[PDB]
Amino acid sequence: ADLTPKVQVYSRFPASAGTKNVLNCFAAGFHPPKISITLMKDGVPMEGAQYSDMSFNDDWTFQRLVHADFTPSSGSTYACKVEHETLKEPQVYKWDP
Amino acid sequence: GSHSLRYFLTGMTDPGPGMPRFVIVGYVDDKIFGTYNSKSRTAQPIVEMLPQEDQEHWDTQTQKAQGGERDFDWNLNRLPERYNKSKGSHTMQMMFGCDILEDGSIRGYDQYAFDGRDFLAFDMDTMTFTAADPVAEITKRRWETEGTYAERWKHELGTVCVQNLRRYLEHGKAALKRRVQPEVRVWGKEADGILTLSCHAHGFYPRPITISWMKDGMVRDQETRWGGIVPNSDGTYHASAAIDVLPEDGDKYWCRVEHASLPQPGLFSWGSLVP
Ligand SMILES: CCCCCCCCCCCCCC(=O)NCC(=O)O
Ligand SMILES: [Cl-]
């Protein structure tokens, strides 16, 4: 019953090297609504990322989707960095493609 | 059939740098149909679902959302003093809408929360209220004695919401009736003599889906972990299920996926290819 973000990282399509895709970072179940969500490639924030309008689920906890069009490259590491006042330090969620 | 219209309103004293302090997201049947925010100050349709909307309807939505924004701004300034918890950031939320059930009957919803906790709710079937704490109780008692709120929201939920739902179902039918079949990937990762199998369904619509793990024809629901249904940005959805198994049994487990787009369930296994 903690208000920390529960985070999932996934692509719109099952990934294949060189094929256009969308990378998603979905955070949910958190409170307060202020939250930092950054999609990263090799530790560099990804260009073109967009964030959904703030919304919430039935128990009033908040959720937010961050997504970026991208072409996955082999050898790179994609991840989502999340910061929230319920967390003592940032948490990093790797994409397992 | 059965259909739902829902509005999710949020006001924040501390939204984050550059973020709007007030936001509304509207849903028809698990599909976002329009939004409002205090930066743009405009209610706008999602044009991929509603591509031919008249201006007057959305000016009316904008006028109502602007009134909501002002009310949320007042509450965020005033409720903290009434709770004697002035410091810190604060939030106000409301969810309301309507269902048209399979038999044609109507159901209304109207609930509020402050700082993420139940505040008050309104029952449009009986035109009564309930409140979760003494601050909300004072508001509730004033509203019910005056009688204006209940008449307004019975009409809002039971007439306007229903009419708008029927409108959006008709105007957005092309997007709503569409079925997108999921693409499924099965993956296995072994560690410490345990093989974790995972099954991910990518990009399906509509939202309802089931994922199960099966062995010897028998479902293994007690051993399965589900990640939950989560959205893609194009209006489709994603879902997952995982199970821990002995490495020597990896190729005996099958992930079963049921979805409206699949006349019979899909069945996928680790170590096999699907041409
Ligand atoms: C999809 C975006 C367009 C949405 C249009 C609908 C907006 C409805 C806003 C209701 C505002 C309700 C405040 C309230 O209940 N205040 C209580 C009070 O102060 O008396
Ligand atoms: Cl939602």
Numbering used by the authors:
A (entry chain B): 1 to 97
B (entry chain A): 1 to 275
Task: Quote the passages of the study that discuss this structure, keeping the authors' original sentences.
Here, using a mammalian recombinant expression system combined with mass spectrometry approaches, we identified N-myristoylated peptides as endogenous ligands for the chicken MHC-I-like protein YF1∗7.1. YF1∗7.1 exhibited the typical architecture of MHC-I and MHC-I-like molecules in which the heavy chain was composed of the α1-and α2-helices that formed the antigen binding groove and an α3-domain that was non-covalently associated with β2-microglobulin (β2m).
Next, to gain insight into the molecular presentation of the N-myristoylated lipopeptides by YF1∗7.1, we determined the crystal structure of YF1∗7.1 to 2.0 Å resolution that was produced in the same mammalian expression system as for the mass spectrometry analysis. The native YF1∗7.1 protein adopted a very similar overall structure compared to that of YF1∗7.1 that was produced in Escherichia coli and refolded in vitro with a root mean square deviation (rmsd) of ∼0.6 Å over 313 Cα. The high resolution of the YF1∗7.1 crystal structure enabled identification of a clear electron density emerging from the binding groove of YF1∗7.1. Our ESI-MS analysis of the produced YF1∗7.1 suggested that N-myristoyl-glycine (C14:0-gly) was the most abundant ligand within the YF1∗7.1 soluble preparation, so this ligand was then modeled within this residual electron density. The structure of the YF1∗7.1-C14:0-gly binary complex was further refined and confirmed that the C14:0-gly as the bound ligand within the YF1∗7.1-binding groove. Here, the C14:0 acyl chain was sequestered within the A′-pocket, whilst the terminal glycine headgroup was positioned towards the F′-pocket of the binding groove. The overall positioning of the C14:0-gly myristoylated lipopeptide was similar to that of the polyethylene glycol (PEG) molecule identified in the in vitro refolded YF1∗7.1 crystal structure. The C14:0 acyl chain occupied ∼70% of the A′-pocket volume and contacted the hydrophobic residues Tyr7, Leu9, Ile24, Ala43, Phe96, Tyr149 and Trp153 of YF1∗7.1 via van der Waals interactions.
